Amino acid sequence: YIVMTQSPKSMSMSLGERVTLSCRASEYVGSYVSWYQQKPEQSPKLLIYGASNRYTGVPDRFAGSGSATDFTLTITSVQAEDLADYHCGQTYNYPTFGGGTKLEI
Amino acid sequence: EIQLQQSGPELVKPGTSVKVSCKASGYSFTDYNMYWVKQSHGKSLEWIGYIDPYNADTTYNREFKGKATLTVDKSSSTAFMHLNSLTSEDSAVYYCARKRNNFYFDYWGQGTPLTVS
Amino acid sequence: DNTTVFTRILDRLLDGYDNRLRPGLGERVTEVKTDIFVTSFGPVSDHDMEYTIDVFFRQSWKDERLKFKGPMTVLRLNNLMASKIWTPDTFFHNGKKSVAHNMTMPNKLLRITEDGTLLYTMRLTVRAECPMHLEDFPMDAHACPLKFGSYAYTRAEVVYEWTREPARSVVVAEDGSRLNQYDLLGQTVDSGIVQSSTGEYVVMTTHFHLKRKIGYFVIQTYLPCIMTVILSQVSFWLNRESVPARTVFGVTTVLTMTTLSISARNSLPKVAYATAMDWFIAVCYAFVFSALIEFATVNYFTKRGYAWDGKTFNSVSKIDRLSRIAFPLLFGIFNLVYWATYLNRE
Amino acid sequence: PSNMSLVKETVDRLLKGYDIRLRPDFGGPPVAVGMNIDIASIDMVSEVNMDYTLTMYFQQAWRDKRLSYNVIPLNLTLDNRVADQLWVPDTYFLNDKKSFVHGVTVKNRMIRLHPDGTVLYGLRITTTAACMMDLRRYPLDEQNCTLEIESYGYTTDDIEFYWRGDDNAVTGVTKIELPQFSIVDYKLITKKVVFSTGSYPRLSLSFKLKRNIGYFILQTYMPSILITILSWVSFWINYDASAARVALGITTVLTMTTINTHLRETLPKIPYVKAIDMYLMGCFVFVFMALLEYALVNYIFFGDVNAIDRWSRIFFPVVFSFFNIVYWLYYVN
Amino acid sequence: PSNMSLVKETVDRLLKGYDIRLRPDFGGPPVAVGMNIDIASIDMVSEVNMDYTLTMYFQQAWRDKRLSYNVIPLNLTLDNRVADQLWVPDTYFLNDKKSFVHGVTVKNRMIRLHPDGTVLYGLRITTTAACMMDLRRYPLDEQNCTLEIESYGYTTDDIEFYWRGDDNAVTGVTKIELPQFSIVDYKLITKKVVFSTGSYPRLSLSFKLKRNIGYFILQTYMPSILITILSWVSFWINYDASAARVALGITTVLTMTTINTHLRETLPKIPYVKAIDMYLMGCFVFVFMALLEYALVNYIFFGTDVNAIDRWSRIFFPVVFSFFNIVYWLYYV
Amino acid sequence: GDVTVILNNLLEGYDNKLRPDIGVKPTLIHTDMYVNSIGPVNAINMEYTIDIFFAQTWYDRRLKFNSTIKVLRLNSNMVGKIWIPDTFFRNSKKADAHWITTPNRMLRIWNDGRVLYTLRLTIDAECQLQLHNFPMDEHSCPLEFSSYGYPREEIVYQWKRSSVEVGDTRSWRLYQFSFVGLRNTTEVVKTTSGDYVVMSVYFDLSRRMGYFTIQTYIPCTLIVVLSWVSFWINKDAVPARTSLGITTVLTMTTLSTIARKSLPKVSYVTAMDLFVSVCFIFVFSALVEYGTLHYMDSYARIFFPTAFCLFNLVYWVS
Amino acid sequence: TIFTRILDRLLDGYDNRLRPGLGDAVTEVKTDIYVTSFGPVSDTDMEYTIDVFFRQTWHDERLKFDGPMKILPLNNLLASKIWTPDTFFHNGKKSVAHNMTTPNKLLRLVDNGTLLYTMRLTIHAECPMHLEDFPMDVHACPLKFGSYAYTKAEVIYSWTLGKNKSVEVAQDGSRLNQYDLLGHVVGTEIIRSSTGEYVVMTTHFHLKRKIGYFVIQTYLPCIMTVILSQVSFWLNRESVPARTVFGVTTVLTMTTLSISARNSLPKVAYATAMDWFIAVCYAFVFSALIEFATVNYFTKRSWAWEGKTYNSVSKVDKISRIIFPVLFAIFNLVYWATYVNRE
Ligand SMILES: *[C@@H]1O[C@H](CO)[C@@H](O[C@@H]2O[C@H](CO)[C@@H](O[C@@H]3O[C@H](CO[C@H]4O[C@H](CO)[C@@H](O)[C@H](O[C@H]5O[C@H](CO)[C@@H](O)[C@H](O)[C@@H]5O)[C@@H]4O)[C@@H](O)[C@H](O[C@H]4O[C@H](CO)[C@@H](O)[C@H](O)[C@@H]4O[C@H]4O[C@H](CO)[C@@H](O)[C@H](O)[C@@H]4O)[C@@H]3O)[C@H](O)[C@H]2NC(C)=O)[C@H](O)[C@H]1NC(C)=O
Ligand SMILES: CCCCCCCC(=O)OC[C@H](COP(=O)(O)O[C@@H]1[C@H](O)[C@H](O)[C@@H](OP(=O)(O)O)[C@H](OP(=O)(O)O)[C@H]1O)OC(=O)CCCCCCC
Ligand SMILES: *[C@@H]1O[C@H](CO)[C@@H](O)[C@H](O)[C@H]1NC(C)=O
């Protein structure tokens, strides 16, 4: 299948600081890439779909973009509730999620 | 509103079998597929398989081909996953994920922890 | 009476059915799950920057007005029913001129499942524009697009979808390849939004990744070009005193390259930039022209008009002897640099 | 006139309540549709477009119990415009790129209802059918071009095909005169091809077209032979006549290049050497070596010589004959 | 489904009693029709046929009071088959030679009724419009091709045209890429042309198209220049080498003629000499004088001074050729 | 009007699907043809275009009317409303009816039920050309036609007295041929669907060699004459003799190729292909004559022109 | 709605299969043509294409109305619901009635009942060409049209604005690349056929071929080729290889010119005037080679001039270099004079 690789395994960004989360695909996935937020003991919640669009009822601080095989999720200013693990998936083929990326202060 | 409610916590021993269900509400079941996802403790999510509820067609991951079976009840909105020949490596939390489009998984299940020991 | 049961079902489906209004008009978006089974990837006309493709263009959408209950789950119907129902006004954005085959009858199947789902498939020969950038031609590869979407309905009215995983929703028949000078390496599919003068529209893009085969152009162009370069460099090994013979070599060889250079362009569009073959032709033109200029230089210093017999005789020109080894090395080094630069790109 | 009234009400009875949407035995077993073809001509075989133009009388017979009549003892042959009021198989030719039914003085079409219920449905169709020709042996090639008769919408559970008469179905093949080919064989096949939408019945009429080597011998091989034979006259010319032999050698070499380009211009831009190319390249190597023969004689006298010409006089014909024998045997057999 | 039933009643209400034969405000003031184009591509600008193919999303907007609805708050986009049940302007392109609406998968048309009564009527049209090209400066020519959009049956007393949005109406002209052209400017004009039947509203969409000279260096000028330069090599060859110089000279004269006729067979049969002909004529004179230069040298010796004509012609010919170019290029560039 | 009520009476209860006297007797049809212009004869595709006012006549008992009006001359609007014979042309590759400004059809009905039906057609009929005396070959190109569905028991055709009324031949598009004569026959051919009566009109077309003589033979003959010039040229001029020889040999290789461009790709030698080949032999012999001579000349000056004209007499007599 | 009330009454009880005044008189169809563009002329097919606003005016008492508008411009679709003359072009090879974006037709019912029915048509009509004087021909290409079914006793055609004002050609509307439209003359005749008598309207467009294109592509190459052959005379007579290349190249050049010339021309046996010019040019070119052959015949020493007897320039060469450019000169004068001076 297609493996998704989150380059920064962890971070230590401060509250109110911009943070970038990178996601790489072993091969083409088109715009079919999405980001989900996994708090501890909580199921994933979709934030970004299509590699650029934002799911309805989501804060505007979550901004994501990218091209083929290069996808980034950027948070302009993180809040207390924004500290959680992040998974980038691909649905151009049989779905395969990448390793989680977690944030610290 | 939409809400997927899975079975719940489970306790089992190697060699037995366990069935975990994924009820769906708020939308017609046959409209959209239902994907099943596994996540070990502190590990990346893994895709097991999905079932087309209308014609009950199924597609399985090669890693989980023959290890799990996907069945669906059209009358009562629920997707069922059955595991057999359980082992210690299969102790994880299992989610069921609706697919609204070919872009994203809209609504995810609560999550069903699995313990093998 | 045996078929009267199904006649009364079809009559009920179209009773009060307005085929001008889409499903969910004013209620929901009409999701059209599409699929393409390329029965055969037609020829690519680089001259017109277009390619032909034969497809079983499949479209599936839910139409709640066409729910039925009966002794069968899937009504298999001829095209005559299709014109009675609403179908998506799908068109091809880069389509130049396409044919909906209808011999013997309209090549369209229309299956209505009991839940209202439709499977509307048609056989088309789509002649689509492929904007071609022939910078590396003939060692070039093109991602010829096949864009399609609703002509009238905006994204708020109809949205298009792939019926399977996007990688698995465009299938090419195993023997379905009518390409002569191309190889269908594969396809990649994407879905985007195009902003137009009328509104926002969903566009389903399919990039058939074609790589040209240099087999034709190697025989047709490069070998005559190379053998013309080697025909010219035969003149170096002839005696300088043979002025008409070496002169005939240069003029004929240079004349040949002009014919070849004109000939090569005739198979291409009249692009205003030089292609990779143009530089090869230009260098080959330079190498034959230099081989005539070299002879003209030798003829300049040819102090005598009579060749060897059996009374000083003209010596072999140092320009010839250097040109004997220089021009096939320089010409060889050019080929290595030329071929390595273009062949090793991705 | 009384019989005309009886025939009128009978045909009116058949088409009254007739539903064109449902096939014969809808919801029942597949309707067995017979097929028989009478080929009128094969107009032209196009390598450039990879197709052949074929004109035929495509007759397909099937049984419709709704169209069975008993009162009159005769086979009605109705006006061809009635076919638009009757269910007909949605037969299509998968290979076709541009096909039509003739339309002068009326639509060239036939309907004839038999008392049993059998419908005999004939159309005069011209088809340009795709035939991907493996031209590696061209012009010594045998092209197995097919006409893939297949139902579009109806699966094997809804329709069935058969050649009405195993080989009595297809007629007129022997009377076809092709200017460039000769139909060695024709085969009739029934099949079931599976698509993602289901399994469908297939009839494949294959023609084992064999190229007429006579035409290409006149246009392609003989000029190459004559030019290659022409280039050999250089070996009897004295070495000092550089302008003559060089002009003679260059003209043959350049003309051979023009010939190679001209023939390939008439053919599609194929990526593989054909049998003609293997011959033209072989001849091209021979005329080119004839040029390099002098350039070798020149470069030993100026930069023994008589013997080099003497051997070239004999070997170039002989070793070119061996090229022909090896060439013809490999491709003819 | 309830909303769709409401939409069904509204659409059926409009077409009920709708006279397709009578234009909006028939017998009243002229109906103002709004054109706006979106050039999808300009294909095959043909000098031989004096026409260019132009694909476009030709949109016409007019107010049809009979098609005003107030119950539905959204803009009804109806199926393309409804256009046949509606009055549309009888718009035609006066210089259209061969045109069609695209018809795959359906008829490429748009009908979008707006609540106020506006009707946005879109068509995807490929049209081979006629453009009489003044090829005197060809290939250095800026061809001013137009699309003469006019109403056929309705005079200015019955219909009026207006670019909707003025110069914003036509879009996509910058994105168009032509292999041998560079669209430099496009202008929109609104006229009123008078025929014997009356005065009619005319919209002329003039594109000023400038030819890309770069292509013609590769295939036309540089081969001519190189051939012209190649002919000068005879000046460097000794006079006694009659066979060499004459062979060089005579080949140059012919190949220029073949190039001249090579372009003329790709070009229409027009009487006026073109700039390419002027350059080829100039190139023809130089090569033809280069041949006559030897013929002068030949008749001077065989009929020190003989060297002088060679030397002066050696440098004068490149000079006067360069002056010919500078005069040529300044005149045309 | 009086005519309108008559027309409504005729079509009332008229079953357009059923032929006149179906199951009672075969419907006799009379066909007469006025060849407006025989289009170009396309030898390459083995076809020719023809423009005709094809008129066919038959009696329909349902279309009899008694009135002071003796005939109803009508436009093409009536054609689709009444039973028309399903006549098709058996050798037509493609056939166009004319529709500008309106469908080019004519229909007339007499009191006795006689119907005269005429329509203008452009027919790209197929003519198998036998190419052995090309371009001195004569062809009898046919134009067959019969009912497509109705067999001999149902539809019968019979030539009228004015069977083929060829018009002014001067206006014809017959560029290469001269229309020599017209013949028409009638025969019954058996098909899988039954026996059908076929009417074939033979147009005997004789080719004019004047065009090809100046365009093909004279260039071939002159190039042969060019080869003869070599003999008078001094043998010592090796580049000149060879240049004259090679250029003429290679020129005929081009003339042989272009000679085939105007012909169908047939698998046999035509007379022109025979003519160019022997001319090829002459020039090749001329070049070979110098090749032997370099390693005699006076004899070639006589034998070559003597042999060439000797071939011409036997060749052109055939 | 009022204009719909009037417009539907005219079609009520209207039989479009019958002429106006059938059995009572002869329907007169007054015709005028506005040539929007005299399209190109195909010599090969003996046809020309002409884009036309074909206007027909006839009186129909069934289509008279009393309404607020004295003239009713209707949609083109109403033309199919009313009787129109079944006009067709006797020499029309192929024609197109444009439908982009709708049928390019206009239909106007004047209050008195007169109908104006105009169509935009492209007409490939036959133009039998007498190419004897090609490329300097004057061709009167006819445009014959008339009714197909209705005999002279039913439908007669006239010119609405008279003979000299019923065929108007737009001043700019000339797509003639190779011809000059000198003018047009219109006439009417009656043709007898096996089905009856019919009125035929003939419009002769007089076309003069522009010799300029052929001056450049064939005549000048022929003249320069003829000049090139006559270049041989000035060259040294011992230069046999150079002279022979001149002769063979020029003669073979003429063959290409002759074949290419006929390539544009149809496959007729008229033996056009260009053939005489090409043939005479061929004879001049061929005779130049024969002149070299006779020079070569008596060229004895075969050693070129040096500074050991030397050859003298042949009297044939001295006379050839005079007579050839004079005989071709006078041949041009007589040739050009005869063809240009013709009406
Ligand atoms: C597969 O698809 C193709 C295309 O999508 C279909 O082909 C088209 O089918 C339509 C519908 O049947 C045809 O329309 C008919 O056209 C008649 C005039 O033909 C001329 O104009 C058309 C313009 O459409 C041209 O295309 C034609 O040329 C082409 O076709 C002919 C064959 O028709 C070929 O021979 C040519 O080589 C071209 O390829 C012609 O130039 C027109 O008369 C006709 O309308 C009359 O009949 C209908 C019948 O329902 C009436 O409703 C209507 O009112 C007309 O009736 C009046 O006129 C007749 C004339 O005599 C009178 O008898 C009546 O009494 C009445 O007064 C119809 O509109 C179209 O020609 C055809 N071809 C095209 C578009 O190229 C195929 O059918 C379809 N199926 C298959 C199996 O292929
Ligand atoms: C564009 C291609 C050419 C551009 C090069 C342009 C450079 C250029 O113009 O060449 C000049 C020079 C001339 O040498 P050339 O070729 O003429 O050879 C000999 C030379 O001229 C002697 O001087 C002559 O003897 P002499 O003493 O006078 O009595 C002898 O005559 P002969 O005794 O036999 O009777 C000549 O054969 O060439 C070189 O030396 C090699 C240069 C490197 C050449 C390598 C270039 C690739
Ligand atoms: C028509 O009327 C005449 C009387 O003039 C009569 O002789 C004839 O038989 C009638 N024909 C019919 C009714 O068909």
Residue numbers in the entry:
A (entry chain L): 1 to 105
B (entry chain H): 1 to 52, 52A, 53 to 82, 82A, 82B, 82C, 83 to 100, 100A, ...
C (entry chain A): 9 to 318, 383 to 418
D (entry chain E): 6 to 308, 459 to 488
E (entry chain B): 6 to 308, 458 to 487
F (entry chain D): 25 to 319, 410 to 432
G (entry chain C): 37 to 343, 419 to 454
Lines from the paper:
We defined the two one-Fab classes as meta-one-Fab and ortho-one-Fab according to the relative position of their α1 and γ subunits. A single α1 subunit at one position and either α2 or α3 subunits at the second α position, together with either β1 or β2 subunits at the β position, yielded receptors with at least four, and as many as five, unique subunits in the pentameric assembly. In the APG/GABA dataset, 3D reconstructions at resolutions of 2.5 Å, 2.6 Å and 2.6 Å were achieved for the two-Fab, ortho-one-Fab and meta-one-Fab assemblies, respectively. Moreover, these subunit assignments only represent the most abundant subunits based on the cryo-EM maps, with the potential presence of other subunits, such as β3 at the β positions or γ1 at the γ position, if their relative abundance is approximately 20% or less. Both one-Fab classes exhibit ordered N-glycosylation of α subunits in the extracellular vestibule that includes a polysaccharide bridge between the γ subunit and the non-adjacent α subunit, akin to the two-Fab class. Intriguingly, the α2/3 subunit may have a fucose sugar attached to the asparagine-linked N-acetylglucosamine, which is absent in the α1 subunit. Furthermore, both meta-one-Fab and ortho-one-Fab exhibit markedly ‘shorter’ separations between the ECD and TMD centre of masses than the two-Fab complexes, which is also apparent as a reduction of angles between the primary axes of the ECDs and the TMDs in one-Fab receptors. To investigate the molecular basis of neurosteroid modulation we compared the structures of two-Fab, meta-one-Fab and ortho-one-Fab assemblies in complex with GABA and APG.
